[PDB]
Design a protein around this motif. Structure first.
Motif, PDB file in Angstrom:
ATOM      1  N   UNK A 199     -40.415  19.878 -12.694  1.00 32.82           N
ATOM      2  CA  UNK A 199     -39.320  20.294 -11.811  1.00 32.82           C
ATOM      3  C   UNK A 199     -39.869  21.121 -10.660  1.00 32.82           C
ATOM      4  N   UNK A 200     -39.366  20.873  -9.432  1.00 28.17           N
ATOM      5  CA  UNK A 200     -39.801  21.601  -8.236  1.00 28.17           C
ATOM      6  C   UNK A 200     -38.976  22.892  -8.075  1.00 28.17           C
ATOM      7  N   UNK A 201     -37.678  22.842  -8.389  1.00 27.18           N
ATOM      8  CA  UNK A 201     -36.823  24.022  -8.341  1.00 27.18           C
ATOM      9  C   UNK A 201     -36.356  24.328  -9.756  1.00 27.18           C
ATOM     10  N   UNK A 202     -35.971  25.598 -10.013  1.00 26.09           N
ATOM     11  CA  UNK A 202     -35.369  26.069 -11.262  1.00 26.09           C
ATOM     12  C   UNK A 202     -34.277  25.071 -11.720  1.00 26.09           C
ATOM     13  N   UNK A 203     -34.337  24.632 -12.981  1.00 26.07           N
ATOM     14  CA  UNK A 203     -33.466  23.638 -13.621  1.00 26.07           C
ATOM     15  C   UNK A 203     -31.962  23.987 -13.608  1.00 26.07           C
ATOM     16  N   UNK A 204     -31.627  25.277 -13.476  1.00 29.69           N
ATOM     17  CA  UNK A 204     -30.258  25.777 -13.445  1.00 29.69           C
ATOM     18  C   UNK A 204     -29.713  26.051 -12.056  1.00 29.69           C
ATOM     19  N   UNK A 205     -30.509  25.793 -11.030  1.00 34.42           N
ATOM     20  CA  UNK A 205     -30.175  26.040  -9.623  1.00 34.42           C
ATOM     21  C   UNK A 205     -29.632  24.785  -8.931  1.00 34.42           C
ATOM     22  N   UNK A 206     -28.518  24.951  -8.190  1.00 31.66           N
ATOM     23  CA  UNK A 206     -27.890  23.864  -7.439  1.00 31.66           C
ATOM     24  C   UNK A 206     -27.645  24.232  -6.004  1.00 31.66           C
ATOM     25  N   UNK A 207     -27.809  23.251  -5.120  1.00 31.61           N
ATOM     26  CA  UNK A 207     -27.449  23.301  -3.717  1.00 31.61           C
ATOM     27  C   UNK A 207     -25.963  23.001  -3.644  1.00 31.61           C
ATOM     28  N   UNK A 211     -25.455  22.230 -15.093  1.00 32.04           N
ATOM     29  CA  UNK A 211     -25.728  21.428 -13.889  1.00 32.04           C
ATOM     30  C   UNK A 211     -25.211  19.981 -14.096  1.00 32.04           C
ATOM     31  N   UNK A 212     -25.499  19.382 -15.265  1.00 34.41           N
ATOM     32  CA  UNK A 212     -25.092  18.017 -15.638  1.00 34.41           C
ATOM     33  C   UNK A 212     -23.570  17.904 -15.713  1.00 34.41           C
ATOM     34  N   UNK A 213     -22.888  18.991 -16.119  1.00 33.07           N
ATOM     35  CA  UNK A 213     -21.429  19.059 -16.207  1.00 33.07           C
ATOM     36  C   UNK A 213     -20.809  19.113 -14.808  1.00 33.07           C
ATOM     37  N   UNK A 214     -21.494  19.764 -13.849  1.00 34.75           N
ATOM     38  CA  UNK A 214     -21.050  19.814 -12.458  1.00 34.75           C
ATOM     39  C   UNK A 214     -21.160  18.402 -11.885  1.00 34.75           C
ATOM     40  N   UNK A 215     -22.319  17.763 -12.071  1.00 36.05           N
ATOM     41  CA  UNK A 215     -22.606  16.417 -11.552  1.00 36.05           C
ATOM     42  C   UNK A 215     -21.767  15.308 -12.224  1.00 36.05           C
ATOM     43  N   UNK A 216     -21.266  15.533 -13.462  1.00 35.59           N
ATOM     44  CA  UNK A 216     -20.394  14.587 -14.164  1.00 35.59           C
ATOM     45  C   UNK A 216     -19.050  14.464 -13.436  1.00 35.59           C
ATOM     46  N   UNK A 217     -18.575  15.561 -12.795  1.00 33.61           N
ATOM     47  CA  UNK A 217     -17.323  15.576 -12.020  1.00 33.61           C
ATOM     48  C   UNK A 217     -17.620  15.019 -10.618  1.00 33.61           C
ATOM     49  N   UNK A 244     -13.621  20.285  -4.987  1.00 33.72           N
ATOM     50  CA  UNK A 244     -12.821  20.865  -3.923  1.00 33.72           C
ATOM     51  C   UNK A 244     -12.716  22.382  -4.052  1.00 33.72           C
ATOM     52  N   UNK A 245     -12.991  23.115  -2.949  1.00 34.78           N
ATOM     53  CA  UNK A 245     -12.936  24.580  -2.905  1.00 34.78           C
ATOM     54  C   UNK A 245     -12.383  25.069  -1.561  1.00 34.78           C
ATOM     55  N   UNK A 246     -11.317  25.900  -1.621  1.00 32.84           N
ATOM     56  CA  UNK A 246     -10.649  26.516  -0.455  1.00 32.84           C
ATOM     57  C   UNK A 246     -10.284  25.439   0.620  1.00 32.84           C
ATOM     58  N   UNK A 247      -9.708  24.325   0.120  1.00 33.62           N
ATOM     59  CA  UNK A 247      -9.243  23.173   0.894  1.00 33.62           C
ATOM     60  C   UNK A 247     -10.313  22.287   1.506  1.00 33.62           C
ATOM     61  N   UNK A 248     -11.503  22.240   0.914  1.00 38.17           N
ATOM     62  CA  UNK A 248     -12.594  21.440   1.441  1.00 38.17           C
ATOM     63  C   UNK A 248     -13.331  20.672   0.350  1.00 38.17           C
ATOM     64  N   UNK A 249     -13.850  19.487   0.682  1.00 37.44           N
ATOM     65  CA  UNK A 249     -14.690  18.737  -0.251  1.00 37.44           C
ATOM     66  C   UNK A 249     -16.092  19.357  -0.172  1.00 37.44           C
ATOM     67  N   UNK A 250     -16.567  19.907  -1.305  1.00 34.27           N
ATOM     68  CA  UNK A 250     -17.877  20.555  -1.378  1.00 34.27           C
ATOM     69  C   UNK A 250     -18.872  19.570  -2.031  1.00 34.27           C
ATOM     70  N   UNK A 251     -20.159  19.780  -1.764  1.00 37.00           N
ATOM     71  CA  UNK A 251     -21.196  18.834  -2.155  1.00 37.00           C
ATOM     72  C   UNK A 251     -22.264  19.439  -3.090  1.00 37.00           C
ATOM     73  N   UNK A 252     -22.007  19.582  -4.447  1.00 35.72           N
ATOM     74  CA  UNK A 252     -23.038  20.145  -5.336  1.00 35.72           C
ATOM     75  C   UNK A 252     -24.128  19.125  -5.648  1.00 35.72           C
ATOM     76  N   UNK A 253     -25.371  19.578  -5.642  1.00 33.44           N
ATOM     77  CA  UNK A 253     -26.573  18.752  -5.893  1.00 33.44           C
ATOM     78  C   UNK A 253     -27.621  19.552  -6.634  1.00 33.44           C
ATOM     79  N   UNK A 254     -28.489  18.881  -7.440  1.00 31.69           N
ATOM     80  CA  UNK A 254     -29.640  19.537  -8.099  1.00 31.69           C
ATOM     81  C   UNK A 254     -30.530  20.053  -6.980  1.00 31.69           C
ATOM     82  N   UNK A 255     -30.905  21.353  -6.995  1.00 31.21           N
ATOM     83  CA  UNK A 255     -31.675  21.903  -5.866  1.00 31.21           C
ATOM     84  C   UNK A 255     -33.133  21.423  -5.938  1.00 31.21           C
TER      85      UNK A 255
END
Length: 81
Positions: A1-9, A60-66, A70-81
């Protein structure tokens, strides 16, 4: 892994989303150890993206499963950092 396994962009953040708002959204998927909203060091203005750190990397896998986030009326983009 290049970034910490629990870290997301997290891209596509609304200007009115605070560090606390960011933390509270991702609390739904795991314990958020810390988070940050990236600022331009030259202007002090938001870059419109951030990072979150989970206590357990399994969250992280639970975030990516969804497929849509949506946060504060916007489509947000979570990704493995």
């Amino acid at each position: 892994n290049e970034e910490d396994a629990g870290k997301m962009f997290v891209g596509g953040l609304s200007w009115d989303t605070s560090k606390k708002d960011l933390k509270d959204y991702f609390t739904k998927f795991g314990e958020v150890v810390d988070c940050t909203i990236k600022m331009d060091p030259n202007t002090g203005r938001s870059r419109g993206f951030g990072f979150i750190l989970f206590k357990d990397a399994a969250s992280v896998e639970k975030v990516l499963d969804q497929k849509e986030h949506r946060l504060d009326g916007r489509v947000i983009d979570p990704k493995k950092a």
